[PDB]
Amino acid sequence: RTPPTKVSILDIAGVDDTLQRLLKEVWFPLRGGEACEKMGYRYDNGVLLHGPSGCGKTTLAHAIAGSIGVAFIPVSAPSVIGGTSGESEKNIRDVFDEAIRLAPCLIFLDQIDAIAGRRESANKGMESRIVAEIMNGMDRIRQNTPLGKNVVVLAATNRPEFLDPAIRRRFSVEIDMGMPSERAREQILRSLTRDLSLADDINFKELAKMTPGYVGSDLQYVVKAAVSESFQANIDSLLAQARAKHPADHLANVSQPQRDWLLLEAHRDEEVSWPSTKITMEQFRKAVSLVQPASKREGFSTIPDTTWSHVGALEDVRKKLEMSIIGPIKNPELFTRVGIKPAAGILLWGPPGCGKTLVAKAVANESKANFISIKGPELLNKYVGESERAVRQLFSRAKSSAPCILFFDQMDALVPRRDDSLSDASARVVNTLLTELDGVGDRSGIYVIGATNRPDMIDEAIRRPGRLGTSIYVGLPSAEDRVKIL
Amino acid sequence: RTPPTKVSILDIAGVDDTLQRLLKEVWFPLRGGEACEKMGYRYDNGVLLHGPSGCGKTTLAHAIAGSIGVAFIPVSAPSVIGGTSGESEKNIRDVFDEAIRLAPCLIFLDQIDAIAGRRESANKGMESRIVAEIMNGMDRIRQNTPLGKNVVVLAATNRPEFLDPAIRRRFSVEIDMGMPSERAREQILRSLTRDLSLADDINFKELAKMTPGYVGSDLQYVVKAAVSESFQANIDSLLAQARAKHPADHLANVSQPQRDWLLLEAHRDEEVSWPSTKITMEQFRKAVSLVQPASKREGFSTIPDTTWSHVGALEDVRKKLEMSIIGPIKNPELFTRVGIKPAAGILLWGPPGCGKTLVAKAVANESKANFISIKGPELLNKYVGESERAVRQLFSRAKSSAPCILFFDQMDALVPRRDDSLSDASARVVNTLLTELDGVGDRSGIYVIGATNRPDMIDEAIRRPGRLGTSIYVGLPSAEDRVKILKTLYRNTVQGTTDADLEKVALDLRCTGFSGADLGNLMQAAAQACLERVYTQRQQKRKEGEEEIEPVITMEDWEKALNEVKPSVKDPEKYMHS
Ligand SMILES: Nc1ncnc2c1ncn2[C@@H]1O[C@H](COP(=O)(O)OP(=O)(O)OP(=O)(O)O)[C@@H](O)[C@H]1O
Ligand SMILES: Nc1ncnc2c1ncn2[C@@H]1O[C@H](COP(=O)(O)OP(=O)(O)OP(=O)(O)O)[C@@H](O)[C@H]1O
Ligand SMILES: Nc1ncnc2c1ncn2[C@@H]1O[C@H](COP(=O)(O)OP(=O)(O)OP(=O)(O)O)[C@@H](O)[C@H]1O
Ligand SMILES: Nc1ncnc2c1ncn2[C@@H]1O[C@H](COP(=O)(O)OP(=O)(O)OP(=O)(O)O)[C@@H](O)[C@H]1O
């Protein structure tokens, strides 16, 4: 026998539309069993949950089980596999047999790509046999159903492409647990904070606003990070206290971390009372700085200490830049009300060493937004199909986490190979680039900045509005400006 | 002992020709056993059923067993495998032994590729041994047959290529359970609806007509979807009822889904009576929209909210497009009667940012048909045999589900590498493409649209009729058109609309030498200048003197923006001549 678990339903939020759909599909067959039997009509059998890792797929399933109050049978990816070639199949049968016998129940298949991958990618005679066992089980359920058997099969996967097209057909209902919004993040923050004693200066709304590409798991961690930051006061207190009980003069010290460690080791059986302190908004900001956006292993470059005070003159350019980049990031409300779409990109052109690279970083800094710098030919490969795939990947990464400034330094290499027929590799790359800039999808938050020391040989197609339309000239010929720089 | 099951024979339909053949081959040996024994003539032993998953292979077998009334022995793929190396073989023997002893019977081998795959692909000593056991069993049946033994071996598989050529030879009769037609779908719908109380407004014929690439399993689901949609009224009723029994004020709510859940949890042992309601045609349409064609894994790019109202002018082009794409999709009757074959493809060529990509989407939307967009080089791999295989796969997917528009953006890359000998990889891909277009696979429903900013270097072979013959030029040089575009852009704002201002702006010399992209930029520039005015004025007044924000845009803003902005495209001679 396997009874349900006690998990908090008030923990998951930001999934309003999806949870509603799930409720509709699952509530009627499980709760009103007598009604469905009398009518004779057939219902939903399989529900597949997809999306990235840590999106709360496992939690959602657990929550749903507890909330409804039905029997939960957890089937993890390697829990059914045995030692001998036959025990694995026997177990699958027993699972389905006990499940159909006892009702109402929820069978949860966590991480299904490990059990049922594509049968062409699996050259083993055991793996193909397991897929077959699952298929047989599915059919048995369908036949037994009109009597009084009520079982819904839930499943969770991280990638739909790895799954066998055959099982995809068997499953009917699909729910996409993707990326959260401003409102959604706010809700998630509230769910996590629920057990904590927050101070009056904390505005969860402000946190959510200034939290771009963070997921449910990331926000969970930000909360945990804040907890550790607050308890630093208690550490300092203990250090001072320890140095008074056991002085040890200057024999216990060679460095700072080592001395602290030694004092604690000496104490051992000393129990201390910890006061319950409240968290500040400053502590949260500190916690946020030290957190990774889950997609840290990327082309993510940190913003330098470059401000407007480092740039002498160019006040006109500064204002123009503020309008384009800082305008949409800081004031989305203003842009939506007036009626215009947010910017796409700008081009910095002129003589070498005039501050083009600095300006790009400076703007990114000011906006407190992310910055990625791809210089010259750091894209091209020796192979016929990795360069284009890589460019696609960059835009995908950018789309996932916004606000970000995408900087392209020295574009004089890639762009002129269009007007005159030369190479085939160069042709493909530039065409993919044009496509990524102007084509299907590619929303705002991502502002592309291009820079070149040579504006001469460049294709007009790239210059066209919607791609890189705002041509900003960076030059230096005046006296007043020079004094400011000095 | 294993007696037959009670499955509905009135559930499967659309398999008229195939079911007839099956009946002929299976009826005589099973039903008239005395007659065959007397004659001394030999009959059919093995019947193999093939086709895609969920095609009703298992059901057909079950149905046939029940209908005839013979003994059913179900042999599933892993049901015979044991623990020790010998039990598996012993079981296979016992199955065949009991089967020959008791007659008339139907042995059904469900999913056979898991038991008997190619012996070269199986490096295990057990798998090869199992194939041998099956072969031995087959021979034993043949020898025993002239006495009074009547057993027919049915089998189901999803792929014929994975099966061992040896067993293929052993099996004599083969039935292909493929895809349905308009008439067939109608029949399937009726089979499923049989137990439901349909309303008078429901026309199953209309549903079937507007259901392109759906299979037996898909239609089954559409019916189930409708059931769930109807029972939403009961959910609303329960919600209102619950909030009256247990109010809980405003403590039970943080959001909407959570509050609903909590109320139900509180009730538990409360039984409610559900009224039997009828379904509407509207509910079916809603259900259809939310369903997947089981081939959603493909690369199903959804159609945007782009209509003809979003495109300023180009009325001539609009009509031409309607003729070619909407003509065959909406009116197949017209085309069959006149005598012409449906279209294959069109080419959109001209200056950048003139609405080529938009047009493609717009047409797809209008037809309510599917849309796939492959841009530049999203096909090529680093390996020597995946690029060509992928292209083949795209056409296969398109063939399976039609109506669909296949869009190729920026063809200037793939096409010119023919006229001059350069790369080998590029050569193979383009040749495969030409083959897919003209070869044998172009059975309509699939309309290919190509777009290029550079019509110059392209191979004439691709341009040839039957492939991409309809060359449509997308350009922009007139006053009336510009006014329409300006109105279209300034249409999407939400008081002050001002029509006179728009016309005057168009008249100016600077505006004459512009394009669609330029006009869009001008609009944005004007908006930015207006914001500057609002910010400077508001801040000065608020600090010295909180007031209201004014989003209004006048002519002074337009004039200043107009003065500064310069055009993008310079020489039109390049595009026109080449
Ligand atoms: N949407 C969310 N709301 C609140 N908490 C979340 C959310 N997503 C994840 N978490 C936190 O992160 C943890 C991981 O969730 P879970 O394991 O369900 O994610 P997952 O998508 O199933 O990951 P995987 O599929 O890789 O196992 C949870 O225990 C929860 O505390
Ligand atoms: N206005 C400026 N203020 C401060 N430093 C400057 C300025 N202009 C140029 N420099 C110096 O020149 C260097 C290069 O600046 P940057 O790279 O931004 O110029 P550029 O126009 O991109 O030309 P290039 O990168 O080709 O030298 C910087 O390290 C900086 O110290
Ligand atoms: N042609 C059809 N007509 C009516 N219903 C069908 C048809 N095909 C499938 N179904 C429905 O879908 C279910 C699945 O059918 P079945 O399992 O026989 O398909 P299959 O081709 O054997 O799949 P697999 O071979 O992968 O097991 C049936 O129980 C039936 O209700
Ligand atoms: N007639 C038009 N109506 C509305 N928008 C237009 C029009 N022409 C161009 N545009 C704008 O230009 C952008 C690009 O349009 P589209 O991609 O269809 O042009 P194209 O001819 O394919 O050239 P490219 O894609 O190379 O810029 C769109 O986002 C759209 O806002």
Side-chain angles (χ1 to χ4, degrees), chain A residues 2-486, chain B residues 2-578:
Chain A
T2 321
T5 51
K6 293 179 180 180
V7 189
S8 54
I9 315 91
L10 303 82
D11 201 80
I12 311 90
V15 284
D16 299 286
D17 296 271
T18 53
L19 201 54
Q20 269 188 298
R21 280 208 63 202
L22 186 63
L23 171 65
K24 192 202 295 178
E25 271 75 82
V26 186
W27 209 82
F28 174 57
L30 293 189
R31 303 286 300 153
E34 297 179 90
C36 71
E37 285 172 79
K38 287 176 183 179
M39 287 162 208
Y41 315 154
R42 290 298 113 237
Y43 48 81
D44 300 282
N45 293 270
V47 184
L48 184 68
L49 310 176
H50 57 280
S53 180
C55 279
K57 289 182 259 64
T58 310
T59 56
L60 201 77
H62 274 255
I64 268 61
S67 62
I68 302 167
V70 287
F72 198 55
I73 316 297
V75 188
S76 185
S79 293
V80 287
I81 315 296
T84 52
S85 298
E87 204 181 336
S88 303
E89 299 142 56
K90 194 183 180 297
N91 289 336
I92 299 164
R93 270 174 52 243
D94 286 301
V95 169
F96 281 75
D97 280 302
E98 253 195 286
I100 64 169
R101 199 190 67 212
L102 306 169
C105 305
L106 261 173
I107 306 168
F108 183 49
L109 267 292
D110 200 37
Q111 294 169 94
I112 199 166
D113 61 275
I115 305 171
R118 298 180 66 94
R119 280 182 290 187
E120 57 171 52
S121 64
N123 293 285
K124 192 70 183 65
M126 263 287 270
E127 296 183 47
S128 53
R129 223 190 304 154
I130 293 166
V131 183
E133 241 305 294
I134 303 300
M135 232 66 96
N136 184 58
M138 292 296 278
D139 290 295
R140 285 185 295 161
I141 300 170
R142 201 175 301 273
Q143 295 182 100
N144 287 74
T145 309
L147 297 164
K149 317 292 177 291
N150 296 284
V151 286
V152 184
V153 186
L154 257 170
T157 183
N158 302 35
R159 37 179 138 121
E161 308 172 77
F162 220 77
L163 308 181
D164 189 33
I167 60 162
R168 279 269 300 191
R169 288 179 66 108
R170 273 286 181 268
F171 273 69
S172 54
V173 201
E174 284 175 40
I175 279 90
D176 193 1
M177 281 192 87
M179 277 296 281
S181 59
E182 306 182 281
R183 316 290 86 220
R185 290 190 296 268
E186 183 189 80
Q187 291 166 255
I188 299 169
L189 286 164
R190 287 187 290 209
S191 307
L192 308 152
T193 57
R194 191 176 54 91
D195 295 271
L196 290 70
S197 303
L198 304 178
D200 299 274
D201 67 330
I202 303 171
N203 196 31
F204 43 83
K205 195 178 181 181
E206 279 184 81
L207 274 313
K209 283 175 182 178
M210 298 304 277
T211 300
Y214 293 66
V215 208
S217 207
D218 298 331
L219 295 164
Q220 172 198 22
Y221 295 147
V222 179
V223 174
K224 295 177 180 180
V227 179
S228 60
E229 295 302 299
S230 65
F231 293 126
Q232 284 182 266
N234 294 266
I235 264 70
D236 291 298
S237 301
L238 281 159
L239 260 59
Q241 194 183 91
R243 269 136 59 188
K245 291 181 177 179
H246 285 270
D249 293 272
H250 287 286
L251 298 168
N253 50 75
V254 185
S255 61
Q256 306 82 71
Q258 296 183 307
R259 74 174 185 232
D260 299 325
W261 276 103
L262 263 59
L263 292 163
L264 310 165
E265 290 172 55
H267 287 44
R268 291 292 176 86
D269 293 83
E270 293 289 289
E271 281 75 69
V272 59
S273 56
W274 283 51
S276 298
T277 51
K278 284 189 175 183
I279 38 278
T280 51
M281 183 58 190
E282 295 180 271
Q283 283 173 8
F284 266 78
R285 290 175 180 162
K286 199 174 181 182
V288 176
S289 71
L290 298 169
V291 181
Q292 58 171 286
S295 304
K296 198 192 89 292
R297 190 154 55 89
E298 202 186 287
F300 269 155
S301 309
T302 180
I303 48 280
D305 55 277
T306 51
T307 58
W308 301 119
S309 59
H310 289 255
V311 189
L314 295 168
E315 303 293 321
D316 298 311
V317 182
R318 288 182 48 193
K319 292 190 294 177
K320 291 176 71 183
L321 285 161
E322 284 179 84
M323 276 287 122
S324 48
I325 303 97
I326 289 80
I329 296 171
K330 298 228 296 182
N331 294 270
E333 299 179 89
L334 186 71
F335 286 69
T336 51
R337 282 184 297 189
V338 299
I340 53 159
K341 286 187 177 182
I346 68 144
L347 182 76
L348 299 166
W349 58 282
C354 290
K356 296 187 285 290
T357 312
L358 299 173
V359 163
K361 297 178 176 181
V363 180
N365 175 252
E366 175 63 39
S367 56
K368 294 173 183 180
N370 286 308
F371 184 76
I372 307 169
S373 185
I374 291 99
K375 308 137 158 190
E378 287 184 81
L379 302 166
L380 294 85
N381 282 256
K382 186 186 177 178
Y383 302 96
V384 289
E386 277 202 34
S387 190
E388 54 98 353
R389 189 108 74 150
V391 179
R392 191 69 179 95
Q393 268 288 96
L394 289 179
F395 282 80
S396 302
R397 290 161 183 152
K399 267 286 287 175
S400 190
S401 297
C404 181
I405 285 84
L406 191 62
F407 186 50
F408 286 107
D409 195 75
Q410 293 181 81
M411 291 304 269
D412 46 71
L414 312 168
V415 192
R417 302 299 173 201
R418 294 218 71 208
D419 51 86
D420 50 340
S421 300
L422 263 298
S423 181
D424 195 35
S426 62
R428 288 193 301 273
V429 181
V430 71
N431 286 318
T432 329
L433 199 71
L434 287 164
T435 258
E436 288 302 296
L437 286 166
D438 195 56
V440 201
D442 198 78
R443 286 189 176 189
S444 290
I446 310 95
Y447 304 106
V448 184
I449 301 184
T452 182
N453 303 27
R454 295 188 60 139
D456 41 84
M457 277 294 121
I458 274 165
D459 189 21
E460 293 180 76
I462 286 83
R463 287 188 283 211
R464 190 216 64 124
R467 297 182 178 130
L468 288 175
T470 321
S471 299
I472 298 176
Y473 176 57
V474 192
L476 196 66
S478 47
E480 299 179 89
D481 294 40
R482 298 201 301 278
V483 185
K484 294 172 184 178
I485 301 165
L486 288 167
Chain B
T2 322
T5 51
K6 292 180 180 180
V7 189
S8 54
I9 315 91
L10 302 81
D11 201 80
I12 311 90
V15 284
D16 299 286
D17 296 271
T18 51
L19 201 53
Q20 268 188 298
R21 280 208 62 201
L22 185 63
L23 172 65
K24 192 202 295 180
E25 271 75 82
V26 186
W27 209 82
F28 173 57
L30 293 190
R31 303 286 300 153
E34 297 179 90
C36 70
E37 285 172 80
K38 286 176 183 178
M39 287 163 210
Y41 315 155
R42 289 299 113 237
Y43 48 81
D44 301 281
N45 293 269
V47 185
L48 184 69
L49 310 176
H50 57 281
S53 179
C55 282
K57 290 182 259 63
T58 310
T59 57
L60 201 78
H62 274 251
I64 268 61
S67 64
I68 301 168
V70 288
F72 199 55
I73 316 296
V75 188
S76 186
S79 294
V80 288
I81 314 298
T84 52
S85 298
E87 204 181 337
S88 302
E89 299 142 56
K90 194 183 181 297
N91 288 335
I92 299 165
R93 271 174 52 243
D94 286 301
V95 168
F96 281 76
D97 281 302
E98 254 195 286
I100 64 168
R101 198 190 68 213
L102 305 170
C105 305
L106 261 173
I107 306 168
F108 183 49
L109 266 293
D110 200 37
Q111 294 170 94
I112 198 165
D113 61 275
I115 305 172
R118 298 180 65 96
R119 280 182 290 186
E120 56 172 52
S121 63
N123 293 285
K124 192 70 183 64
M126 261 287 269
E127 296 183 47
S128 52
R129 223 190 303 154
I130 293 166
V131 183
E133 241 306 293
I134 302 299
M135 232 65 95
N136 184 57
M138 292 296 278
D139 290 296
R140 285 185 295 161
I141 300 170
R142 201 174 301 272
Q143 295 182 99
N144 287 74
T145 309
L147 297 165
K149 317 291 177 291
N150 295 283
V151 286
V152 184
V153 186
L154 257 170
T157 183
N158 302 36
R159 38 178 138 120
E161 309 172 76
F162 220 77
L163 308 181
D164 189 33
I167 60 161
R168 279 268 300 189
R169 288 180 66 109
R170 273 285 182 269
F171 273 69
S172 54
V173 201
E174 284 174 40
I175 279 90
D176 193 1
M177 281 192 87
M179 274 64 88
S181 62
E182 305 182 283
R183 315 290 88 222
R185 291 190 297 267
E186 182 188 80
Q187 292 166 254
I188 300 168
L189 287 164
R190 287 186 289 208
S191 303
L192 307 151
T193 57
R194 191 176 55 92
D195 295 272
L196 290 70
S197 302
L198 304 178
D200 299 274
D201 67 329
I202 304 172
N203 196 30
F204 42 82
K205 195 179 181 181
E206 279 184 80
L207 274 313
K209 284 174 181 177
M210 297 305 275
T211 300
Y214 293 65
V215 208
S217 205
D218 298 331
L219 295 164
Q220 173 198 21
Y221 295 146
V222 179
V223 174
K224 294 178 180 179
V227 181
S228 58
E229 294 302 298
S230 66
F231 292 126
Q232 284 182 265
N234 294 267
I235 264 69
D236 290 298
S237 301
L238 282 159
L239 260 59
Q241 195 183 91
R243 269 136 59 188
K245 291 181 177 179
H246 285 270
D249 293 272
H250 287 286
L251 298 167
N253 49 75
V254 186
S255 61
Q256 306 82 71
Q258 296 184 307
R259 73 174 185 232
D260 299 325
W261 276 103
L262 264 58
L263 292 163
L264 311 165
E265 290 172 55
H267 287 44
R268 291 291 176 87
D269 293 83
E270 293 289 289
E271 281 75 69
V272 59
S273 56
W274 283 51
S276 298
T277 51
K278 285 188 176 183
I279 38 278
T280 51
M281 183 58 190
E282 296 180 90
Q283 282 173 9
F284 266 78
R285 290 175 180 162
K286 199 174 180 182
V288 175
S289 72
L290 299 169
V291 181
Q292 60 167 118
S295 301
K296 197 186 68 64
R297 184 220 67 226
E298 172 182 294
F300 259 52
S301 302
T302 180
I303 47 281
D305 54 277
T306 51
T307 57
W308 301 118
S309 58
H310 289 256
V311 188
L314 295 168
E315 303 293 321
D316 297 312
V317 181
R318 288 182 49 191
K319 293 189 295 178
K320 292 176 72 181
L321 285 161
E322 284 178 84
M323 275 288 122
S324 47
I325 303 96
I326 289 81
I329 297 171
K330 298 227 296 182
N331 294 272
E333 299 178 271
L334 186 71
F335 286 69
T336 52
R337 283 184 296 190
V338 299
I340 54 160
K341 285 188 177 182
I346 67 144
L347 182 76
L348 299 164
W349 58 281
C354 289
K356 296 187 286 290
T357 312
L358 299 174
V359 161
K361 297 178 178 181
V363 181
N365 175 252
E366 176 63 40
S367 60
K368 294 172 183 180
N370 286 307
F371 185 75
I372 308 168
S373 185
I374 291 99
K375 308 136 155 190
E378 291 181 274
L379 300 169
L380 295 83
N381 281 247
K382 65 170 184 177
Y383 300 100
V384 287
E386 281 202 33
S387 190
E388 54 99 352
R389 188 110 72 154
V391 179
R392 191 69 178 95
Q393 265 289 94
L394 287 181
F395 282 80
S396 300
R397 289 164 185 150
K399 266 286 290 171
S400 189
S401 297
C404 182
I405 285 83
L406 191 61
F407 186 50
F408 286 107
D409 195 75
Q410 293 182 80
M411 290 306 267
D412 46 70
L414 313 168
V415 194
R417 302 299 174 203
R418 294 219 71 209
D419 52 86
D420 50 339
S421 300
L422 287 176
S423 181
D424 196 34
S426 61
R428 288 193 302 272
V429 182
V430 71
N431 286 319
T432 328
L433 200 69
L434 287 163
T435 259
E436 288 302 296
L437 287 165
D438 195 62
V440 69
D442 200 87
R443 289 82 172 212
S444 293
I446 311 98
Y447 305 105
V448 182
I449 302 183
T452 182
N453 302 28
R454 295 188 61 137
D456 42 82
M457 278 295 122
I458 275 166
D459 188 21
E460 294 180 76
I462 286 83
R463 286 188 285 213
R464 191 224 62 142
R467 297 182 178 130
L468 288 175
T470 322
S471 299
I472 297 176
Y473 176 58
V474 192
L476 193 65
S478 46
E480 299 179 90
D481 295 38
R482 299 201 300 278
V483 185
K484 295 173 184 178
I485 301 164
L486 288 167
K487 285 189 176 183
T488 305
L489 293 167
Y490 200 66
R491 193 180 57 103
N492 306 275
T493 45
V494 286
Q495 294 180 84
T497 178
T498 59
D499 295 271
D501 291 57
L502 302 159
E503 280 83 54
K504 292 178 182 179
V505 174
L507 290 172
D508 292 279
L509 305 168
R510 25 270 180 99
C511 290
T512 316
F514 269 3
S515 64
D518 295 331
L519 297 175
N521 198 256
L522 214 184
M523 191 270 263
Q524 283 198 333
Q528 287 180 254
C530 185
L531 293 182
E532 290 182 85
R533 187 185 59 89
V534 181
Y535 254 75
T536 53
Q537 201 177 267
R538 195 193 65 217
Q539 286 176 280
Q540 192 187 94
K541 290 190 292 179
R542 279 187 176 194
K543 293 173 184 178
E544 291 188 288
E546 295 181 89
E547 291 183 271
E548 296 179 275
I549 310 92
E550 295 178 275
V552 66
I553 176 173
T554 53
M555 215 173 137
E556 299 179 271
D557 305 296
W558 257 301
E559 289 177 43
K560 286 178 178 294
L562 187 67
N563 285 123
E564 299 179 273
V565 71
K566 293 295 176 181
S568 55
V569 188
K570 295 294 177 181
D571 291 352
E573 298 179 87
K574 186 185 174 296
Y575 305 105
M576 289 298 268
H577 280 286
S578 296

